[PDB]
Design a protein around this ligand. Structure first.
Ligand SMILES: Nc1ncnc2c1ncn2[C@@H]1O[C@H](COP(=O)(O)OP(=O)(O)OP(=O)(O)O)[C@@H](O)[C@H]1O
Ligand SMILES: [Mg+2]
Length: 1036
């Protein structure tokens, strides 16, 4: 983020204190456009060298913040923003972030020496970088509650409680207070739980060994570590206190908590004096914070030495934690409710205008008129609204946890509107285990193949190349490492034995030892090893890489002419194949290369030896999930780095690419490299599917920008994709306004997961920080679960909107109808209606889960859609008609009359007006809940969640019992009894008529009649995504 800054000290003690002693009212006003509010009161102008209050000025940012400056100990002026420290430097006369001496301005020589820091005073290093800990703040209950109890909604609720108390409506005020307290408790619990769960991810404290200049040693706590300090890895122990660079020795770590992959990763000592150092160059020579150490070996001497380079939030996990906690925006925002709220507000305004008009006709005193008029606007805003909403997210998260998906959440609703998904091939769409079908000897005989053979008999460079070209290690009493290396070593039958210090057991010629090793990285598809055995003239070198890459990394004469056909035959069958190569590596070059640690020299003029053939089968759950996802018109795309033929075969097996397919290849020598197209198996078939290679996608995006947009739309199989290209592909797809989610397993695609709208990890076992979503089950069947849960949550939220609006308007209309005559509902009646009937039903409404199968129809877009408003208005017409009919029916019977213009106060409540209206409205409050809560395409039937049905039945039974002329609970509580037996036959008949009419109307509106009418004359809507979608019609 880019932004300038400015600051100045406080205004000198004087008029400002006294003026904003009174000017505290505009606090709510300044919540919008806060820059002027801080310019007043606090901020004068000052030079940019003695600032205390520090504020930002935009360069690309749109928000605003103010910061506090602190000095310690040169007084070291500094300030912290978003967890990043900034320190004033005299030479530059500007604030500088704490990254000096890092990011390529220090070389491997000074870094290499950099020993023991110094027996210096603690001020210089500790103060600048601070304590080494990722401090997630904690707050006390009084400190926490003030952050949400000051919202304008709760201020208005307090105003209402004050208003009702002045009117002697004691009971209703208590109900409002209880509901507000419940809402506050729910929000506080949510915030506390989220903060606590995030805090657990941060590691705990411990103490390590740290050396000092000379020969001294120390046993200090981890909190005292600072950059430049050298520490010794303890007893091959556990977690890494902080990021550090390995200067001496070799070890391996488990980076599942940071990269999401549980496969052990080898690390090697940092080369000396090569050049400037950086995280990218340090990837295979550094240890990241929060990563376990499995085994460490002392190359030479009694210690394995690492040098700390980053501490606190600056560490690798610190940035991920900051990005987890601080956020920026989904860009699928929901700012569409303002106009619906305005539409509701205009009705409220006209209703209160009518109330104040008619209320004057009753000659009510000049003071009682205004309070009773204000009561209308007071009741329009529905209490418990925040409570019904904070609980929906809790329900969704709890249900997701129950199924083994651990979401970090605002993306629950986002995941329900996915339209394109990316998948990896190995591990994700297929089995992790690998079966070896043998090797193809190529070490002679006119370069001709010797036919595959699953053997271990012959002795030669190929056998020991297989036996030693790996990075296996012994943990406890079993080997651990890459499954592919384990399977290869199993085929040979050689056993890993417990300068080189690693050797193979089986000794047909003689036992073999490994002098040097180069670990793998996803950027380059190869690994190297230096091997020596007794009696050898000089050590040899063996490498293992992708067949295509190594085929071009060896002597051109050695590789056979028909290598392409040989590689295509096995790959086209669905096998996963590799290649092996070896180098004579003469004596002096062999000795110097290992000493100098230069990798380029070893991976030079090699000689191809053979190919390993592996069998990798699809997971049984892969095909049904893909078929179900694709049936609902959701695009599925394969992003893989494997060979293109194998990826195409797997995609065909998975069910993808049913119709014709085509290939685009890099075969062109012209400087622009015009890309030809070939039919996998002439006109331009618009039903074609496109498959691209890594370099092909890398050059097309560069040289043919305008051909790219209609290639991504049709691309299905991406092969030989580099780890950085996956993120590029994900970002490019989003430029088409796509909503892309990705499911990845390996560590190479960690960056792609972050870029995607929703990222799901399959092999991970906890709610880590790498991806927003983590799946404990190693299968792709979780994506449909996420999609269905998201759409169900969205539908539940819309239903909550509708029910809350209906209840608010119903209460408003009932109160106004009472106002038309001369009477008001009793305070106890309001307490009942609000606290019990509305709240218990609203809170329990969101319990029902998602449907068992996905549907073609997508969830609703916005509230302003004609069907929602039309249904609301029709339901209100029905409700008001029912209420007015019930009211008018009473006049037929001999019923006396209320003492209008005699008392005209809420003390004559024992009358026939409030009784019937209350009885009819109480039933409607429950009837409306069922009508709108009903669901099918996205939610399970209403009778699925037992508690909601039980509560509805209990409330309906209680109300019906009340109606059926009891001698109790109906007289003392401001209700009037009637001897005529019109309850069962007529009043309940009208209630049932309302019930059936509302449900029939809701069914009619649910059916496609309202939507089909809107289809005329055109169909296009105002949503901008349709503008990009229509381009597919022109592109196909
Ligand atoms: N020992 C090895 N270490 C690393 N990569 C290897 C090794 N042997 C072969 N490879 C090659 O790595 C190439 C691609 O690297 P990458 O890590 O992207 O493969 P991958 O992880 O199998 O891809 P995917 O995740 O799609 O399966 C593959 O062609 C594979 O043959
Ligand atoms: Mg994988």
């Amino acid at each position: 983020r880019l932004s300038g800054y400015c600051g100045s000290p406080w205004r000198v003690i004087g008029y400002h204190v006294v003026v904003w002693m009174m000017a505290g009212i505009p606090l709510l006003l300044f919540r919008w456009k806060p820059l002027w509010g801080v310019r007043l009161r606090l901020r004068p102008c000052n030079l940019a060298h003695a600032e205390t209050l520090v504020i930002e000025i935009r360069d690309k940012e749109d928000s605003s913040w103010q910061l506090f400056t602190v000095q310690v100990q040169r007084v070291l002026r500094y300030y912290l923003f978003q967890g990043q420290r900034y320190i004033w430097i005299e030479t530059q006369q500007a604030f500088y972030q704490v990254s000096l001496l890092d990011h390529g301005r220090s070389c491997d020589d000074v870094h290499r020496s950099r020993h023991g820091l110094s027996l210096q005073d603690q001020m210089v290093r500790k103060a600048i970088y601070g304590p080494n800990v990722i401090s997630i703040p904690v707050k006390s209950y009084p400190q926490l509650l003030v952050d949400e109890a000051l919202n304008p909604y709760y201020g208005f609720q307090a105003f209402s409680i004050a208003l009702w108390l002045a009117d002697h409506y004691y009971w209703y005020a208590l109900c409002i207070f209880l509901i507000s307290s419940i809402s506050i408790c729910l929000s506080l619990y949510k915030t506390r739980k989220q903060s606590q769960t995030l805090r657990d991810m941060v590691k705990l404290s411990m103490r390590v060994c740290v050396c000092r200049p000379g020969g001294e040693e120390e046993w200090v706590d981890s909190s005292e570590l600072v950059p430049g300090d050298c520490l010794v890895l303890p007893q091959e122990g556990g977690l890494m206190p902080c990021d550090a660079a390995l200067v001496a020795g070799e070890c391996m770590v488990n980076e599942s908590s940071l990269t999401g992959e549980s496969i052990p990763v080898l690390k090697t000592a940092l080369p000396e004096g090569l050049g400037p150092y950086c995280a990218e160059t340090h990837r295979r020579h550094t240890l990241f914070c929060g990563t376990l150490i499995l085994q460490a070996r002392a190359y030479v001497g009694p210690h394995v030495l690492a040098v700390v380079t980053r501490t606190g939030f600056c560490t690798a996990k610190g940035g991920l934690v900051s990005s987890i906690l601080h956020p920026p925006i989904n860009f699928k925002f929901y700012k569409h409710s303002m106009k619906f709220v305005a539409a509701l507000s205009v009705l409220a305004l006209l209703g209160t205008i009518y109330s104040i008009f008619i209320l004057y006709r009753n000659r009510v005193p000049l003071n009682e008129i205004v309070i009773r008029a204000l009561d209308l606007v007071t009741v329009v805003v529905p209490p418990a609204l925040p409570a019904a909403m904070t609980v929906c997210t809790l329900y969704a998260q709890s249900r997701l946890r129950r199924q083994g998906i651990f979401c970090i959440p605002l993306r629950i609703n986002l995941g329900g509107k996915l339209q394109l998904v990316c998948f990896d091939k190995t591990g994700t769409l297929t089995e992790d285990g690998l079966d070896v079908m043998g090797v193809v000897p190529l070490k002679g005989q006119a370069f001709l193949p010797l036919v595959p053979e699953p053997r271990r008999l012959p002795v030669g460079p190929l056998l020991r190349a297989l036996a030693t070209c790996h990075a296996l290690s012994r943990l406890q009493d079993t080997p651990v490492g890459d499954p592919m290396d384990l399977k290869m070593v199993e085929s040979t039958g050689w056993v890993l034995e417990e300068e080189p210090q690693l050797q193979a057991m089986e000794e047909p010629p003689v036992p073999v030892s490994v002098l040097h090793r180069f670990p793998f990285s996803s950027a380059l598809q190869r690994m190297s090893v230096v091997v020596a055995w007794p009696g050898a003239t000089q050590p040899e070198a063996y490498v293992k890489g992708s067949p295509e890459l190594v085929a071009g990394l060896c002597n051109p004469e050695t590789v056979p002419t028909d290598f392409a056909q040989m590689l295509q035959s096995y790959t086209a069958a669905g096998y996963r194949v590799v290649a092996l190569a070896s180098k004579p590596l003469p004596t002096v070059p062999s000795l110097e290369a290992a000493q100098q640690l230069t990798r380029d020299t070893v991976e030079g003029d090699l000689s191809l030896l053979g190919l390993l053939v592996m069998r990798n089968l699809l997971k049984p759950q892969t095909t049904p999930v893909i078929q179900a996802l694709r049936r609902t018109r959701i695009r599925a795309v394969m992003v893989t780095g494997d060979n293109l033929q194998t990826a195409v075969t797997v995609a065909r097996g998975c069910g993808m690419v049913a119709p014709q397919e085509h290939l685009i290849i890099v075969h062109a020598t012209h400087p622009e490299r015009g890309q030809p197209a070939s039919l996998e198996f002439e006109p331009d078939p618009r039903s074609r599917h496109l498959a691209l290679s890594g370099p092909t996608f890398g050059i097309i995006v560069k040289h043919f920008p305008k051909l790219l947009p209609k290639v991504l739309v049709q691309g299905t199989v991406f092969a030989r994709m580099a780890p950085e290209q996956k993120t590029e592909l994900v970002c490019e797809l989003q430029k088409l306004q796509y909503c892309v989610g990705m499911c990845g397993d390996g560590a190479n695609d960690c960056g792609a997961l972050k870029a995607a709208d929703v990222g799901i990890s399959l092999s991970q076992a906890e709610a880590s920080v790498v991806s927003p979503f983590t799946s404990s089950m190693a299968s792709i069947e979780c994506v449909p679960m996420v999609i269905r849960e998201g759409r169900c949550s969205l539908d539940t939220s819309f239903s909550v909107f509708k029910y809350m609006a209906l209840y608010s308007l119903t209460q408003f209309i009932s109160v106004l109808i009472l106002y038309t005559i001369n009477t008001n509902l009793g305070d106890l009646q309001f307490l009942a209606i609000d606290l019990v009937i509305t709240t218990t039903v609203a809170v329990l409404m969101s319990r029902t889960g998602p449907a068992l199968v996905l549907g073609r129809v997508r969830p609703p877009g916005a509230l302003l859609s004609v069907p929602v408003l039309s249904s609301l208005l029709l339901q209100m017409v029905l409700v008001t008609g029912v209420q007015l009919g019930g009211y008018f029916l009473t006049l037929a019977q001999p019923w006396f009359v209320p003492l209008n213009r005699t008392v005209a106060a809420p003390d004559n409540l024992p009358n026939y007006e409030n009784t019937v209206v209350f009885s009819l409205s109480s039933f409607q409050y429950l009837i409306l809940a069922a009508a709108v809560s009903k669901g099918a395409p996205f939610r399970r039937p209403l009778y699925t969640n037992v508690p909601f049905l039980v509560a509805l039945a209990l409330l309906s039974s209680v109300l019906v019992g009340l109606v059926l002329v009891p001698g109790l609970l109906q007289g003392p509580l401001a209700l009037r009894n009637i001897t005529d037996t019109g309850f069962k036959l007529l009043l309940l008949g009208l209630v049932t008529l309302n019930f059936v009419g509302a449900f029939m109307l809701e069914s009619v509106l649910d059916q496609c009649l309202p939507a089909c009418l809107r289809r005329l004359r055109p169909k296009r809507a105002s949503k901008k995504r349709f503008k990009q979608l229509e381009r597919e019609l022109a592109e196909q």
